[PDB]
Design a protein around this ligand. Structure first.
Ligand SMILES: [Zn+2]
Length: 216
């Protein structure tokens, strides 16, 4: 066998795809945005269905989220509450954060809380000289980066199958990639088609695995 992991971002609210993923037929890691009406509960349902859970942390691109204008103190406080809000969370993922992720001061604060929680961090590859690898290597926080790309702002069932197979290429090649998809508007589409590709993955000896298992 050869391993790969899928993270599904953007849980927390009642958007398309969440019930489907939360039954736990597919081996995905659930990334919950905190402070939403159902953040805590979806986290609790994911755990009972046997799915790993991480915090999907809202950072600003180029809403008690992480903005450029926050003190280090305010950042750590916000991230501590997000972990409290998401039970079972073993790690953290960056919701967007194009700009915050080039900010050493604030990214440092974030990774310091992550370490306090003995958690890891996944760089959901929002951009292009991310500071996470460097920072997570110094502070001794396990980290890994997205490979793709499951999903997008305007994605279709076919398009998702096409990216599952790309994911498959990288996996047969043995580099243990991480795929990232989304619940939300396009979100039944990404469940359908991830689900439709499980048999093929099994057949080509690829196993889906909680992202944690593919650290350090
Ligand atoms: Zn997101």
């Amino acid at each position: 066998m050869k391993r790969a992991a899928i993270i599904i971002d953007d849980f927390g609210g009642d958007v398309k795809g969440v019930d489907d993923f939360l039954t736990g037929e597919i081996p995905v890691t659930v990334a919950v945005m905190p402070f939403l009406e159902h953040s805590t509960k979806q986290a609790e349902i994911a755990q009972a269905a046997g799915l790993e859970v991480i915090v999907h942390m809202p950072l600003e691109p180029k809403p008690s989220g992480i903005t450029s204008n926050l003190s280090v103190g305010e950042v750590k406080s916000r991230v501590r509450k997000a972990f409290d809000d998401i039970p079972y969370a073993v790690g953290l993922n960056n919701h967007m954060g194009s700009k915050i992720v080039e900010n050493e001061k604030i990214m440092r604060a974030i990774l310091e809380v992550v370490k306090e929680k003995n958690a890891f961090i996944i760089d959901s590859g929002t951009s292009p000289h991310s500071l996470i690898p460097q920072l997570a290597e110094e502070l001794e926080v396990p980290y890994a980066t997205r490979s793709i790309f499951l999903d997008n702002t305007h994605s279709s069932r076919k398009e998702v199958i096409k990216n599952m197979r790309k994911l498959a290429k990288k996996a047969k090649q043995g580099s243990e990639p991480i795929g990232i998809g989304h619940v939300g508007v396009r979100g039944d589409e990404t469940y359908a088609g991830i689900r439709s590709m499980l048999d093929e993955f099994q057949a080509e000896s690829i196993q889906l695995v909680p992202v944690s298992q593919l650290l350090p």
